Symmetry: C2
Subunit: 225 residues, 2 copies
Amino acid sequence: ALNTLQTALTTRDSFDPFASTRTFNLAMTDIGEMSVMPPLMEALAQRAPHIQISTLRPNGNLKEDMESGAVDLALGLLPELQTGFFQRRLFRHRYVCMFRKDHPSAKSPMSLKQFSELEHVGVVALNTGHGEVDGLLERAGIKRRMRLVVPHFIAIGPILHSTDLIATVPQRFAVRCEVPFGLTTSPHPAKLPDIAINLFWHAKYNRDPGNMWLRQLFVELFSEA
Amino acid sequence: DSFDPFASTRTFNLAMTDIGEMSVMPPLMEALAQRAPHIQISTLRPNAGNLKEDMESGAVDLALGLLPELQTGFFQRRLFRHRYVCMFRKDHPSAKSPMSLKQFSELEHVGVVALNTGHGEVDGLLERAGIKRRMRLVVPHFIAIGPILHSTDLIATVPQRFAVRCEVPFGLTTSPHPAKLPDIAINLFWHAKYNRDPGNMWLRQLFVELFSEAH
């Protein structure tokens, strides 16, 4: 409470995007990183040619590092960031089926029956919303032949390219993969709910001009709301 | 005892970095499609702690990498080396191959921390050699590198094994690296208790066949 007044009393640091040499530290998952970072850096080349960016995984501690200001912004599903945090809804993950373009049998739209006949690569994606996919399919009684399981998304494009495996992936991932790896997608035959992704900042930095500048750029580039 | 690949139902568990996963798993799964149609594979990162223990106990069958801590109780066999190259988009406005040290220190970089791996040594090495870099972006892992280089004028120092997987998909080209970054030897590792396990031996020989650069 006395903090809120002290944070308001301080003369806020000037932010000139053309001249700033500030480093912004951003927490996001490997999916957020492959999705946001290319167009973010593309925009920043034209908007703020001298700042530095670095990213990290949320899984820190994030809460404490955001209060100190060691981490500027966090993107994801971060249930623990509650008191002292502002948040804003950016976009949703929708899950699709992905497989190579000239797959011998896979169809779009894929049926639930075909989904169950084909072989899968699964992604564990521990402590993320993508991590709930396995449990969701299992609980629904949807059988999958789990031919390969990997912990993270990096190898999925090249794996699907070279095999007749299919994958359950967020559409934002699939979109970065379809052309580079000669892949197609189908809408997903199971009942997978969306994951709503938010951008988070600490209240200490709610009126920090640099922070405000960067988060508005995230809204501008990525907001679907 | 003995082992039948064409009818085995065994799950093998394999420890591997993200570079390892992205380079070995496509041709590995491709081979297995024919040779072992019924086995299961799962992978994990070495730094998802207690690898020694999980290898001793047979929870993890094989490890791939530079894993200096795997000594007594473990066998190892050299498969190949990492050579560092410079990578950037094919229609980059100014970047040339072979790239000079001058251009290297003038262009802007994306760096990969790759903590607790051989690749994690790059930053310190270049620094101690007094090679300057404008670190415009630092990311912890390699997943976003291809798309980042495609959409920017950034350049990256990456293992050639990564680069060769990214060049055509992302429209990138590579250059020999102007610095003197040492090559990194990549070994296959297995626990002594599993030296003569027939399933393990069979998978090890398949790694050798697909990946060894000996000849």
